[PDB]
Amino acid sequence: MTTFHDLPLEERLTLARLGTSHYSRQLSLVDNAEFGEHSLLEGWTRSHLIAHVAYNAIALCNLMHWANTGEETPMYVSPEARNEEIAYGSTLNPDALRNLHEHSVARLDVAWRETSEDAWSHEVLTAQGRTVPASETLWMRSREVWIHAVDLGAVATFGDIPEVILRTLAAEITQKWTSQGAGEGLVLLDEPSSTRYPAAPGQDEVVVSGSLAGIVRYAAGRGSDGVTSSTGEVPEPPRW
Numbered sequence: 001m002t003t004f005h006d007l008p009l010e011e012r013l014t015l016a017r018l019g020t021s022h023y024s025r026q027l028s029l030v031d032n033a034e035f036g037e038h039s040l041l042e043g044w045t046r047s048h049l050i051a052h053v054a055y056n057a058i059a060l061c062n063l064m065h066w067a068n069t070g071e072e073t074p075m076y077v078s079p080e081a082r083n084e085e086i087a088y089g090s091t092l093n094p095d096a097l098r099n100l101h102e103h104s105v106a107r108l109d110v111a112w113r114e115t116s117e118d119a120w121s122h123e124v125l126t127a128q129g130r131t132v133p134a135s136e137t138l139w140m141r142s143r144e145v146w147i148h149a150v151d152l153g154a155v156a157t158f159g160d161i162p163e164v165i166l167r168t169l170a171a172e173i174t175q176k177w178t179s180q181g182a183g184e185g186l187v188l189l190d191e192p193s194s195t196r197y198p199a200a201p202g203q204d205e206v207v208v209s210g211s212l213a214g215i216v217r218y219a220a221g222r223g224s225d226g227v228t229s230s231t232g233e234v235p236e237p238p239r240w
């Protein structure tokens with residue numbers, strides 16, 4: 001069982017496009033009057049989330065420009081600028097935000113469509129400091145649209161997410177925790193497939209198990225309803 005990264009470029013582009021359409025269907029379900037209400041993400045109204053998804057598309061466009069021109073263009077000018085623009089976007093009227101989402105989506109797709117073969121492997125830097133090939137934007141965008149589709153609070157679920165994306169997320173999140181020395185002894189178990197996703201090593205093992213969608217929702221900090229613990233009590237997972 002392969003990861004998103006092993007997939008051919010065309011299939012990764014399709015998954016990103018599918019996730020975007022999935023996210024857009026959820027946004028379409030939300031009413032303009034509901035933008036000001038809390039999203040499923042603490043501290044963020046739907047407007048904040050909707051703005052963020054658009055600014056992320058724009059940030060990924062920067063990496064693709066960097067890739068195609070060879071001229072360094074970071075995802076965001078600065079952490080402050082990233083936060084400040086999300087703050088600004090969250091104040092915009094609903095239709096303005098729907099237009100921003102639509103246009104930012106369209107522009108990122110064009111960026112991908114016009115990317116040269118060599119540019120796809122050009123090294124760029126993520127906002128988190130990772131050195132990756134430009135093609136990583138296909139994965140990065142997929143994480144955003146498939147997961148934030150759920151955060152919109154309409155009808156999207158982790159169960160809606162293609163397994164290849166869920167498997168890659170389970171591995172990535174636990175790999176991130178491991179790199180940070182987080183989640184000592186904590187191991188996620190995709191019970192149906194008997195696949196373990198360990199974090200940092202510890203003396204007391206705690207196995208949190210469920211279906212793949214269940215452990216990913218859990219690892220993503222979005223709930224424990226789909227998992228159970230080997231100790232009878234599910235701990236709060238390390239942040240992500």
Ligand SMILES: [Zn+2]
Binds near residue numbers: 052056
């Ligand atoms: Zn995000």
